[PDB]
Amino acid sequence: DLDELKKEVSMDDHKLSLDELHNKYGTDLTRGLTNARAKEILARDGPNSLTPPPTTPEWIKFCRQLFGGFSILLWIGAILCFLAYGIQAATEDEPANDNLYLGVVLSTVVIVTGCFSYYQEAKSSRIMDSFKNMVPQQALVIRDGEKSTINAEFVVAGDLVEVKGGDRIPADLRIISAHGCKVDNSSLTGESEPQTRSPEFSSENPLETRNIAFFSTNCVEGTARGVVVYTGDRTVMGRIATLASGLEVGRTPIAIEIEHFIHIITGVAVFLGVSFFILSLILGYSWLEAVIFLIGIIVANVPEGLLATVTVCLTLTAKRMARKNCLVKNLEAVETLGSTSTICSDKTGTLTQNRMTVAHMWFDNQIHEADTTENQSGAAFDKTSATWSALSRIAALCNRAVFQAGQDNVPILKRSVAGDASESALLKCIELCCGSVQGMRDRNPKIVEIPFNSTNKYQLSIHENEKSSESRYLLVMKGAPERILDRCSTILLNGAEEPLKEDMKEAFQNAYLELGGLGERVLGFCHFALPEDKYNEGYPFDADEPNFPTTDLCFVGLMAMIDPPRAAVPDAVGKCRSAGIKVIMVTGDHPITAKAIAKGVGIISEGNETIEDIAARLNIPIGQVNPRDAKACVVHGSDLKDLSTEVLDDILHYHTEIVFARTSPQQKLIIVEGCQRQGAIVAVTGDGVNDSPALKKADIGVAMGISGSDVSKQAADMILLDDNFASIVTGVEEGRLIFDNLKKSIAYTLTSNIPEITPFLVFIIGNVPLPLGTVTILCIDLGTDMVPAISLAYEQAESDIMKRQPRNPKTDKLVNERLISMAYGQIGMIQALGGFFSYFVILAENGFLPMDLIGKRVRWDDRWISDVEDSFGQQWTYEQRKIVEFTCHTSFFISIVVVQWADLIICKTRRNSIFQQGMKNKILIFGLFEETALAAFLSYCPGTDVALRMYPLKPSWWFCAFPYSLIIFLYDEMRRFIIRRSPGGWVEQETYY
Template identity: 45%
Template structure:
């Protein structure tokens, strides 16, 4: 009737518009300009019969045109042929880019399906978890702090439930929700206190509501069309690539115009000047770069997804690679989030839980179970909890639950040792509740107690749990084993602190419990707690202390190694937790955040900050001391300590730590799972939310979501981010080095008048054919083995395309490749009787149909006259030799591009995509050189095999040069040459 609880997606652009965009973006416009200019030049310079010949031939049979082109003075129709080749290039590049964009889009759509929103709903008399999109009008849903409201709902129960309505009304302060009816006719429904709207966030408390609208019928659904019209933000990677495209385009146009002018100045014809301008312009354009980069990023995104890391924004991966500080939570991220009850302390006695209730004999256990102090603690632990069982699995530890790890551990312990928790809770109905939050660090609930004999109302009482120090400060009384109440004295406080410290030193999380009985004068039977601010009507003092329950949540097995890898990579791992400093210190040592050998850990007062800094290397900073610390002192602590743990912190303090790290120039990654973490997640350079335990609010604020909630996945992401950055640089370097080899022939043509060593079709073949697959194969290259042994890159200085990369591509590798190709070119010319010195300033005679330009016979030194067609055939063969020289050198270029620092002997040749690409490149080149039909299409000619042999020394020279360069980088990384040679 109502359909799925989803928005109707906005109309997507038609495929032909997306395709058109690909053919008119990046370098495409430059190629369109060159192609159209070629046709314009042809139609303006040639006779009408030539134009009719071309149009007629193309109309009747394009292959017939190619044959005529090569058999009837094809240089006359060169502009038309060039224009057709350039436009064909634009169309094919557009098709490839369009396909890759569609593939990339599918990847990121699949990411959204990895973290669907769920909702708890009452169906068939049971609380169930279902997909939010399956909700319908009339469903009763449960909302807790940190949840996103799954539809428009009418509140029917509220326990201090507050909603962030800022996305709809602009009201930044969370608003209390009540069940009270709105009787003001002039009040907007958006301001009604008994309504909560889809996509807003529950920031505090909890509530129950009945769905009144779903999907497009919600308030936010009415705004969806407006939102869909907002343009997407350009990512940093896209901006950097766009900037690079603009720079190359400007260089292409300016250099083309410059050499056009120089050619005219040196007295060559406008035709020759035009050919040179088009060649220089096209030669500067790395036509295959953008499609190759698209593939690199798509492959990286798929790899991240396979490693349980969902990237909401692609640039987040690259940012993660430059992270220098990780501020991480403890529970669930560093630890397994599988808490079990370890110790209980009540009546002055401590008990260890090991399956049997108190690790005592059966008779002693039964005696303890009858103690009134235990019964009071048991009642408080059972009732002051929001955890619930979602199934009836007979194996209690395997039951699915709703609730945080601590409450779940206590509930399962009580279910196993006492009996059904839910039945016990029904004896004491919950009337109101104040949920736990990281600021107050406690929670409480109010319950009704009936007379066991009559079943009539007896009184109300409060049960409360939280951080032990927060609970103790509100208690004036304690209870003994007979249920008698005594004032809390110094002796008891000392015992409490000793036990608390002992539990915490073993990495146990400790909760304290207390209660209070209300008189009927305070709250009678008919008092309505629902919808009221409990903190205003209840004085949280004069409470009765009941005891402690500790839980152990061991670190994940792979976390110590992950922290060690971060330390090797120059990344500091800082724990920011709400746990007690002693517990935080113990877990930090287990995880390796605080090294065992560092004995200088301090939990002392930081009022004498300087003296502590001078004597310590690692430190635990409690939240109360952090609150009093000025920003300057905090920054001094952050700079001076290598290992830091912040304990008992609030969300605002977590945000402050992040801000101060950023003020020091650090790139900060922050993990978070709660609604209160959203500020720090947004402020961080990269926010990382938990996919399993994370609230919807934290997931919305984050840039990345860990689908397995595992800290080790962050380290994998950092390595992947560095790998992506390295592979992007490798891809760009490889493409530019091959690209520049198509420019140098035009420069020699303009400066020395040497006949062109490369034709435009073969230049395009290099950019879009032979170089494309090897460039894409670098996306699959594994990380270099030292990638996690070097410090984070400086995102402001170490750019993807910098001067060192351009110098290596254009002036070092590019010149080596061009030298080998020119050697093949001149050797071929020499075989046909043209000495290299004869070719200097020979362009006028070479293209003159009336000049016989004699060649010198190789062995007799006799001079033989030549025709223009014979010279064109010789030039095409020499151009084919130049093209082959580039291919041979690019074999080695793609191999040396596999690493930026590590020797290829150590790195290996395990990238089979790259290995295949070399074979593919070779087969493509051979097909165009030795296939007669393709010879006509691409202006190529079979060459002598000796041309390839002459290229091999250059290839090995390139290899040894690169190995020497990388050796200097590894041996002297901090030296001038070590830094300048790293590209």
């Protein structure tokens, strides 16, 4: 699976003669292969079917998730926890259940988090399966001189294959004889343009020559013959499919950010452990205790719910998106749009509507503009002159297409029309502002029509005149404006007629160049009243000789047409450029059309200029001008084929408005790679199959949904179910938003680690009884903290997020040291002081003063010392002192909740004040209320001091943590004040997350 040999541009043999090609493959042009030779080649090369990818079972991925994230740090502990049980059961000591209910709780945490990480794990694309559904089941092959329909898989290289309008090309063929055959190279070019396949050769590029039919296409009309040159994994869209299924997915930014966050966390956990080991050796503890202490500190620094919390956080935004018809297959992708700095878009079908629409019209020496928007929300074109009526008669009569039966329900533009795109566009415009064409057509009976000719270059027909006062004959004709201009001598001005003097002939030339320069295709319409005296109502004008005056006609006016852009395309492109996002057009379309749509949508701002434009404005050769004076550049695919790596880097490094035209799919992949190379995230928005290799290697794919295909839909990460381009703007707002929110929730969940680890550090150092218990740390981490932190995600913006430039990937991170300095350094420290304060209060009120607590652990823990003297001389049994220690765990946990109130409030806003933003978030309020109700419930419910070991508190204790909370609030409030008044100062480069 050599990827480089698949990135190279394809090669072929269309230059050889028919006979020569047969020598290269071994066949008969009039008899084909023999059943013996055909089967022999069937055993030699293999079947004509795209093969399937290697598949990954699911017990594999779920298990992978088990030994991942920091679940490894938790395994060392669940397993260690059991080891101690085995030792107790085999050494015969305690039948109690502490160790075990912990190995079971830790194991359960790992199993549940695994489920949460799976829900987020990239889904497994079925690129090849969709692709495989492409090839039809039975082809028509001519063997031994007879026609037979055989399984397409049984087609080999060399035999004769016949195709008919409506069938799919079973393999890569070399046309030998055609009869008006046309193919739809949508899958390779990206255009529904009907190309024609002729046995003769016409271009050095195999993709442009007509003597080659391509797999993955269909013969729209006509019949043809040919020879099989490529079958299987060797075909063109076959090389593209094989490249698509074998192009890595990448690693999203949210993931890389999670990697960095994990790294940071594990760093401080191993630092604190190595430090308390050297300390435990300087004080005296044995090696068994020093090693056990190390393991305890590391595991204690792991936050059980921050990974699952990030999953819930991302899911709520994906639902908000689902409300605006924006569905994301990958949850991680949701964020990629906000971090994108360069959007590579497709034109036909994505930037436009892929529906030829009448754009501009010429009549009465005046250019008129028509509404070319989906929902018809614009300006009419003044339907009050007689000229327009005559124009409607010309176009509506000299047109053979008709709406498809049963469209009486859909609107006028989205209905199906059988015919060319020009006659269809004209029919739709006339049916739009002139009523039903079916009655307009039956109101005037067509007598004789002479079809479009390759020599005449026009289309004409005569019909009766519905004037009940004029029984004469009407003649109408349409065609290229130059040919029709050479056939007129009058002009229908404002209704009356006038001669064709050079004044209006020059006005017609300037109008032709005006509509032509607009990237539009123009046509000319003229008509004439046949004199009923020289051609009576009974005379039949058989289409044989000159029965109609070719010249001396009456020209009425020109009519242009082009594929317009979707409604919110210009506004969305402008919004993206406003946010500092570089827009680049990439399409396999003609550079004239591509450039016109670029200037019309905002890619090439009006005023910027290309090197050819400067050479034309000055009238000098192009090799003289300097390329640095040109901001925008149009790069052609043929030229793109011959360019080095550095040249592409310079093209993107010096030109701000770029457009790649006539580019194949492999080149699309190359351009995306040229972007990522420097160091930016890329988003590709497409519709057809040639966007598949560009959507796979990009960082995020956006597929349309209504106007797309199944390959682009399955190979994308985000789907736009209504083809509303504006969803891209919404996604760039929400991405940044959901980015700024993860920081707040992370700081919130990282602040409570300190008041959770410090008690054990004091237990081993200062030799005081144990302040905080294991069953309390677990109830906090998975209970109280979750709801307030999941609610932080719903927070609104502070400033206009659509104004700042895209974040930098190498420097701006998600978790930086500025956060650690706040959670681990300033807020968590105060929380620890409040907890220890409530602790000392509980022990001082019951008889154990602070001076007598230092140095007691050895006797405070012993299970056989039933006489422990306190500061007043009383004698406490073992269970009696243990009850007080547990009541201290309960009040410590309640102190944590009290300080989390002020932490959730100071974490609500990173910069702004609370009196500005406001407490409009109902989930946060509910979080505080529930957080308090749960603590009261865990302490006061009967049977809790039996099950969980939490005793009731006396009402005076609940107020020992209040001052610390107010202080936290005031400190952070003054913190978020100097940042506002002083931008760029010490407080900013030291505490601004």
